Design an enzyme around this catalytic site. Structure first.
Site, PDB file in Angstrom:
ATOM      1  N   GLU A  43       2.266   2.862  -1.654  1.00  0.00           N
ATOM      2  CA  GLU A  43       3.275   2.065  -2.604  1.00  0.00           C
ATOM      3  C   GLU A  43       3.983   0.981  -2.316  1.00  0.00           C
ATOM      4  OE1 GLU A  43       5.844   5.825  -3.130  1.00  0.00           O
ATOM      5  OE2 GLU A  43       4.650   6.397  -5.023  1.00  0.00           O
TER       6      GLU A  43
HETATM    7  C1  LIG Z   1       2.301   8.740   0.708  1.00  0.00           C
HETATM    8  C2  LIG Z   1       3.085   9.364  -0.163  1.00  0.00           C
HETATM    9  O1  LIG Z   1       3.083  10.439  -0.816  1.00  0.00           O
HETATM   10  N1  LIG Z   1       4.021   8.551  -0.716  1.00  0.00           N
HETATM   11  C3  LIG Z   1       4.989   8.680  -1.725  1.00  0.00           C
HETATM   12  C4  LIG Z   1       4.288   8.932  -3.044  1.00  0.00           C
HETATM   13  N2  LIG Z   1       5.437   8.995  -3.960  1.00  0.00           N
HETATM   14  C5  LIG Z   1       6.347  10.332  -3.913  1.00  0.00           C
HETATM   15  C6  LIG Z   1       7.596  10.505  -5.219  1.00  0.00           C
HETATM   16  O2  LIG Z   1       8.030   9.134  -5.282  1.00  0.00           O
HETATM   17  C7  LIG Z   1       7.018  10.199  -2.553  1.00  0.00           C
HETATM   18  O3  LIG Z   1       7.696  11.366  -2.090  1.00  0.00           O
HETATM   19  C8  LIG Z   1       6.256   9.677  -1.227  1.00  0.00           C
HETATM   20  O4  LIG Z   1       7.007   9.287  -0.383  1.00  0.00           O
END
Ligand SMILES: CC(=O)N[C@H]1CN[C@H](CO)[C@@H](O)[C@@H]1O
Length: 504
Positions: free
Chosen positions: A324
């Protein structure tokens, strides 16, 4: 032939009788039984004195667990001459085909004998041994009125995947050293062998870095929802590592970069283009934060962090995140991740990273991809480069609500009940890869207490643990579900505040 899938159990969750989970390669029962009495000893014997000494430690760990529930004072003896009524742990003559983590476990009326190739396999086999004894054995206080019997039986076992992990997010909400040790201990009982600590994110920084002290003095002082936060000193982190090592669990620390970095950016103004500290963030938004990819101070910062963390983290791996990075351009991400991989390698560490980090031109075949996206194109680079892949599909995102009405959890990968956490295979997630194994991820946006962790990890983690250990050909939901029902008292006995999933 007729087939069906499982629905909810009518009238609510269901949540001499061993309860082995994950399912072992083979398990047969014969006539007779072993009785563990107050006079039992644990005998240990390795191929040399050093190995026997290691087995002795494993033996003492087992004795402690057995003593807590039986009220006995079972002690450990360095000898290959076990006496009637003994438990015998040995690496002499192990079946090599079972590998480092494999073992044979044969119980007769007079003796329990665990034969492995390595101490590690003795430790894994001891997790099965505990499950052969009656429910009650896993209590932390003395249990009366239960005869401590094990059926005459023959088990052979080894894992399908080498990497079977759990990640805990301690950035979104902080959890104490005691709480972390407890989750490591519980997981170890189900043959989880890797623990990934997500030590930094937007809402907090959790590891002492002596060269950049405001990471703690400023960056650790909050969490999601404005609680006080917290952190681990380097001594505390070393203590966690040592505790995990006693359970043959590798600890992989993660410093997420270049995204998910607000806590660092809130600690040091010089990490930002305008030289000013960011305000701390207590919300759950993602994607907005970035280190400066073209400023040398960024790489000095990363090197200082990596230097200090490498010094206290014996795992050959450091996880550098990479998820992200939506405030980082593709070109800058490629460049940044290659630069930090070179730094990590120079400190003797191989890099793990979330997709799309494998696409960095600076990756090597020694880098590892943690494939969370699990789409058709994910890990194309990893595969081409010969990088190992750890899979974390929706079915392994244990922070997802069990159901629409779950009181905690997220739902951006949908709902993940105990059945969904079981009914998948790593080869579903990515084809044509070297699959190193599986990692269950517990993000903590909505988990504040130990009870919250327990509720979401149990029974979901049991499902994931079996996917990692048991061969696909021997996995069957109807089988696992009934085994899980049988296992329920053991969860209760451990003090796990599990969710009684209505699909079980
Ligand atoms: C690797 C991962 O799962 N990163 C994020 C993905 N998005 C989720 C919801 O915003 C986050 O909890 C994670 O940090």
């Amino acid at each position: 032939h007729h087939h069906h899938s499982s629905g909810l159990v009518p009238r609510g969750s269901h949540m001499s009788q061993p309860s082995i989970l994950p399912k072992p390669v083979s398990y047969t029962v014969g006539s007779g039984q072993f009785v563990l009495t107050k006079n039992a000893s644990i005998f240990v014997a390795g191929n040399n004195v050093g190995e026997t000494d290691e087995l002795f430690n494993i033996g003492q760990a087992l004795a402690k667990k057995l003593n807590a529930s039986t009220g006995y004072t079972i002690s450990v003896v360095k000898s290959n001459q076990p006496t009637a009524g003994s438990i015998y742990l040995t690496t002499v003559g192990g079946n090599a085909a079972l590998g480092n983590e494999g073992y044979d476990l044969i119980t007769t009326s007079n003796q329990v004998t665990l034969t492995a190739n390595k101490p590690e396999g003795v430790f894994r086999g001891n997790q099965t041994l505990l499950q052969l004894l009656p429910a009650g054995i896993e209590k932390n206080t003395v249990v009366s009125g239960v005869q401590w019997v094990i059926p005459h039986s023959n088990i052979s076992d080894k894992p399908e995947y080498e990497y079977r992990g759990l990640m805990l997010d301690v950035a979104r909400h902080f959890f104490t050293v005691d709480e972390v040790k407890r989750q490591i201990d519980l997981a170890s009982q189900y043959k989880i062998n890797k623990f990934h600590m997500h030590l930094s994110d937007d809402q907090g920084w959790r590891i002492e870095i002596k060269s950049w002290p405001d990471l703690i003095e400023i960056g650790s002082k909050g969490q999601v929802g404005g609680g006080p936060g917290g952190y681990y000193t380097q001594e505390q982190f070393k203590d966690i590592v040592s505790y995990a090592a006693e359970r043959y669990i590798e600890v992989i620390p993660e410093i997420d970069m270049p995204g998910h970095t607000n806590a660092a950016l809130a600690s040091y103004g010089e990490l930002n283009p305008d030289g000013k500290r960011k305000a701390m963030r207590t919300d759950t938004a993602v994607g907005y934060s970035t280190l400066m990819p073209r400023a040398e101070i960024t790489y000095q910062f990363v090197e200082d962090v990596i230097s200090e963390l490498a010094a206290i983290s014996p795992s050959p791996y450091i996880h550098l995140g990479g998820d992200e990075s939506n405030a980082t351009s593709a070109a800058d991400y490629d460049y940044f991740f290659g630069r930090v991989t070179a730094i990590a390698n120079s400190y003797g560490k191989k890099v793990v990273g979330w997709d799309p980090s494998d696409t960095s031109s600076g990756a090597t075949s020694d880098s590892v991809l943690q494939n969370w996206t699990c789409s058709a194109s994910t890990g194309t680079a990893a595969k081409a480069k010969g990088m190992k892949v750890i899979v974390s599909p929706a079915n392994a995102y244990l922070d997802m609500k069990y159901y629409s009405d779950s009181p905690i959890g997220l739902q951006w990968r949908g709902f993940v009940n105990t059945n969904r956490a079981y009914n998948w295979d790593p080869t579903d997630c990515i084809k044509g890869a070297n699959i190193y194994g599986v990692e269950s991820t517990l993000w903590t946006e909505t988990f504040v207490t130990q009870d919250h962790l327990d509720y979401m990890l149990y029974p979901k983690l049991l499902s994931n643990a079996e996917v990692g250990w048991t061969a696909r050909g021997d996995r069957n939901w109807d089988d696992f579900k009934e085994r899980l029902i049988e296992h329920t008292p053991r969860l209760q006995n451990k003090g796990i505040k599990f969710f009684a999933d209505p699909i079980v």
